[PDB]
């Protein structure tokens, strides 16, 4: 045979732009924390392997709540962990002498950037059996179980540009491609549906079996 | 020293786009004759030398009388001396089977062309001590003193494209760069302000002295 | 180790476009004097070193006061020190036979230019212990202490293009990158907040200590 195995490799499997966030502005600014595990289709793929190391291509598709496009100037700003957050529509942090920023209209084609692998460890990890800090571990401290500090990539804050208040509503949709991917230690895939963003907890009253059950054993 | 004398040469001094005309449409067409000595900043530069030989880069910036841009199709047409002029909004001369023409909307970036040196003599001249024709020279014929025929480059006529009448107002602004310039015989610069387009006549009741006068001679 | 020290060099530290001015048009023209020390984030960076020599990349992002973009033709004009300033919406100085100028609509992507190092000295300086002129120095003359003449780069004037009056409001935002930078003589950084543009004066009733104080020592 001459069946090729090119388009089943690891790089071709992940290079598809999947939705990761929907950011809505119903003061004209938001401070969206970063968590890219809030949508189930890309999350089930990325949690096949334990450790992953990659770059990315983010794409910001912005429109009004019903797909209409009106001329409105926006500004996105990536805030690393430690930088001063913006507090109002016109704070001092929107000057962006240190942070990268994109200025794009709503009428333009959607913007694209190419972020690098920016983690302090060798690779990202979607599973972390342990606590990030030392000290006592009583009952009231169990928010941080399975919260590794080397995955929090700061926040990502958008705004409308002017110092007045704009009369339009904004819904941003962010899509992420994965380039130059290397993975390690594959895991069993998920069958129960997802409930939160930070933990694998499941609905204990509804154990969804994997295989759709039948009636007998001698008849399909 | 290592002081450069590159950006004081003749070519670098003239390659700046200066305003030469403002064409207004308050029947939807104009026949602007050509005279590029109607604005004082470029005219004082070009009348430093007697003879000049160059190509040019014309640029047509078109908008409404208050800078607003509406979608409106226009047409510029360069008319050489001898060609049939347009008479109405839709004459037979707008077919342009011989003359060059530019079709550009008002919403587009401004158009650019690159005209060559098209004079019958070796170079243009801004000064002409003499009469163009022969014959008697009485008092009533003194419009043509200092009017050389090898500088009249025909006219330049614009219009709105459609056969109906458009409801918008047009102000065209033309800017001219100068490339591949060669000059000859420098002249004393002008100090009195300009009054007309075709002659160096000045206000005889207001002799503006060159130097701003002071009070004494032994103190500044 | 193989830790790279590339992205901590002097060139990579300054090549980020920071805000330097906000120009508002609430006669349809302004004559904004040049002073690029009016915003505190880029000013604290550039005043780390005493002398600096660089080119720049300016970027003009223009919109209405609430981010809306309407089709409106504009014109920016850089005026060197000595050139005739514009006085009205349509003066004689808008012909621009000598000065550089940018014509760009509000609907277009923002314009970019690349100005060179245009100072008469070898480098810019953000600190100048001295007076620019000679003569008597009495009390009423102390505006010019610490005002070097080889930093004033003229003005920068914008307008709406037409001879009528446009019905829209303009807010321009200018951003400046720094390319091919060479610096000299680093200085202690600033801790007190900024008060003016031309002098390092501080609020004498509020001495902000650098370190956030604690209760004990042990």
């Amino acid at each position: 045979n001459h069946h090729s195995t090119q388009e089943t490799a690891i790089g071709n499997f992940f290079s598809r732009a999947g939705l990761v966030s929907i950011i809505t502005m119903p003061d004209g600014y938001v401070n969206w924390d970063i968590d890219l595990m809030g949508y189930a289709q890309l999350r089930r793929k990325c949690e096949l392997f334990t450790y992953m190391r990659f770059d990315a291509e983010f794409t910001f598709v912005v429109a009004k709540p019903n797909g209409v496009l009106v001329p409105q100037l926006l500004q996105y700003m990536y805030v690393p962990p430690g930088a001063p957050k913006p507090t109002s529509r016109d704070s001092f942090a929107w000057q962006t002498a240190t942070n990268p920023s994109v200025f794009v209209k709503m009428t333009d084609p959607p913007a694209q950037v190419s972020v690098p692998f920016m983690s302090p460890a060798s690779a990202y990890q979607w599973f972390y059996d342990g606590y990030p800090t030392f000290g006592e571990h009583l009952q009231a401290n169990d928010l941080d179980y399975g919260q590794c500090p080397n995955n929090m990539m700061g926040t990502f804050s958008i705004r409308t540009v002017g110092t007045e208040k704009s009369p339009h509503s904004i819904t941003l949709r962010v899509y992420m491609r994965i380039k130059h991917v290397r993975a390690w230690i594959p895991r069993p895939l998920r069958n129960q549906p997802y409930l939160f963003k930070t933990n694998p907890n499941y609905k204990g009253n509804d154990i969804k079996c994997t295989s759709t059950s039948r009636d007998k054993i001698t008849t399909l | 020293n290592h002081h450069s004398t590159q950006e004081t040469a003749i070519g670098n001094f003239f390659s700046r786009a200066g305003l030469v005309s403002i064409i207004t449409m308050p029947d939807g067409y104009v026949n602007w004759d050509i005279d590029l000595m109607g604005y004082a900043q470029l005219r004082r530069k070009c009348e430093l030398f007697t003879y000049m030989r160059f190509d040019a880069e014309f640029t047509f910036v078109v908008a409404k009388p208050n800078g607003v841009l509406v979608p409106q199709l226009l047409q510029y047409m360069y008319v050489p001396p001898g060609a049939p002029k347009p008479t109405s909004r839709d004459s037979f001369a707008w077919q342009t089977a011989t003359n060059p023409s530019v079709f550009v909307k008002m919403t587009d970036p401004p158009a650019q062309v690159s005209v060559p040196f098209m004079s019958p003599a070796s170079a243009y001249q801004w000064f002409y001590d003499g009469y163009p024709t022969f014959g008697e020279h009485l008092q009533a014929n003194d419009l043509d003193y200092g009017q050389c025929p090898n500088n009249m480059m025909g006219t330049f006529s614009i219009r709105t494209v459609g056969t109906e009448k458009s409801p918008h107002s047009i102000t065209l602004r033309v800017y001219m760069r100068i490339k591949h310039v060669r000059a000859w015989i420098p002249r004393p610069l002008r100090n009195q302000p300009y009054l007309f387009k075709t002659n160096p006549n000045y206000k005889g009741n207001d002799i503006k002295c060159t130097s701003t006068s002071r009070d004494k001679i032994t103190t500044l | 180790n193989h830790h790279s020290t590339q992205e901590t060099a002097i060139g990579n530290f300054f090549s980020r476009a920071g805000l330097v001015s906000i120009i508002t048009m609430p006669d349809g023209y302004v004559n904004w004097d040049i002073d690029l020390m009016g915003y505190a984030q880029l000013r604290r960076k550039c005043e780390l070193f005493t002398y600096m020599r660089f080119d720049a990349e300016f970027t003009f992002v223009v919109a209405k006061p609430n981010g809306v973009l309407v089709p409106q033709l504009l014109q920016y004009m850089y005026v060197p020190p000595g050139a005739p300033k514009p006085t009205s919406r349509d003066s004689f100085a808008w012909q621009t036979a000598t000065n550089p100028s940018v014509f760009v609509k509000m609907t277009d992507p923002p314009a970019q230019v690349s100005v060179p190092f245009m100072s008469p000295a070898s480098a810019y300086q953000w600190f100048y212990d001295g007076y620019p002129t000679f003569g008597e120095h009495l009390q009423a003359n102390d505006l010019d202490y610490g005002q070097c003449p080889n930093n004033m780069m003229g003005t920068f004037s914008i307008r709406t293009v037409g001879t009528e009056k446009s019905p829209h409001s303009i807010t321009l935002r200018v951003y400046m990158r720094i390319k091919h930078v060479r610096a000299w003589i680093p200085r202690p950084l600033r801790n007190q907040p900024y008060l003016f543009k031309t002098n390092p004066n501080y609020k004498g009733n509020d001495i902000k200590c650098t370190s956030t104080s604690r209760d004990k020592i042990t």
């Epitope: 009004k64 208040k165 704009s166 | - | 309407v70 019905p167």
Partner: antibody, heavy 120, light 113 residues
Framework: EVQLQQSGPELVKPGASVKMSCKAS????????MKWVKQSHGKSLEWIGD????????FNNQKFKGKATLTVDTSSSTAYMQLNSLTSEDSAVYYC?????????????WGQGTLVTVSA | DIVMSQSPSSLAVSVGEKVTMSCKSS????????????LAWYQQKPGQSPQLLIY???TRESGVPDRFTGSESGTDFTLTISSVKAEDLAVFYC?????????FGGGTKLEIK
């Protein structure tokens, strides 16, 4: 939120050229976008132009209704619409309509309108 | 000069539930327009409720009436409201403007309920 007030609606001489003011509610000044209204008595309501002197709309600015559309005076802080006040035509009422943010740009709250009596 | 006509002459309603409008602009430029004042007889004037003829309508009142609605069809139109009783029997009308989205001259013709 609270009510924009006007001055007292009062009268003028057929050649006097007298201003009018529409004293603000109390929140903000000069950041909003002022709009002036003129209606003739057959319920025809033809609008006079905008923001601060940005009043020269589509042919208008002309019957001396809107003539001298002025800027603010900052004392009553919503005062313009100076005119010529011609003989026996400018009999109308005049509304000012400024926005207060959540009523973006267009119409927050109006006044009760100033009747201009040209009756000499 | 350049006019438009909303042409229901009288809405003539017995106190009920359903009623509609149509403003029908005929402006020179055809990309920007937004409309709809209120004009109570007794006292001051609500309004502000914009229907962009071509795309997004309403930058609506999030307060007071939200029962005002939007429109369609590419050609210029504005449409219905809800079931109000003997208070808010007022005279509604569109506004129209020169260059761009602030209130200008052109809100010509009214209609009586």
């Amino acid at each position: 939120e609270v009510q924009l007030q006007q001055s007292g609606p009062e009268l003028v001489k057929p050649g006097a050229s007298v201003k009018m003011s529409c004293k603000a509610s109390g929140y903000t000044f000069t950041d909003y976008y002022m709009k002036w209204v003129k209606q003739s008595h057959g319920k025809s309501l033809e609008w006079i132009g905008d923001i601060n002197p940005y009043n020269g709309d589509s042919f208008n600015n002309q019957k001396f209704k809107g003539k001298a559309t002025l800027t603010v005076d900052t004392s009553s802080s919503t005062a313009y619409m100076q005119l010529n006040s011609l003989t026996s035509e400018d009999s109308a009422v005049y509304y000012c309509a400024i926005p207060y943010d959540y009523d973006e740009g267009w119409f927050a709250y109006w006044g009760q309108g100033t009747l201009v009596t040209v009756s000499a | 000069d350049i006019v438009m006509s909303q042409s229901p002459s009288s809405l003539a309603v017995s106190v009920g539930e359903k009623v509609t409008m149509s403003c029908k602009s005929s402006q020179s430029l055809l990309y920007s327009n937004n409309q709809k004042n209120y004009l109570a007889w007794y006292q001051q004037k609500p309004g502000q409720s914009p229907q962009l003829l071509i795309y997004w309508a309403s930058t609506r009142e999030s307060g007071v009436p939200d029962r005002f609605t939007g429109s369609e069809s590419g050609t210029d139109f504005t449409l219905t409201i809800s079931s109000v009783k003997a208070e808010d029997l007022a005279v509604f009308y569109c506004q129209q403007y020169y260059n761009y989205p602030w209130t200008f001259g052109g809100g010509t013709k009214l209609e009586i309920k």
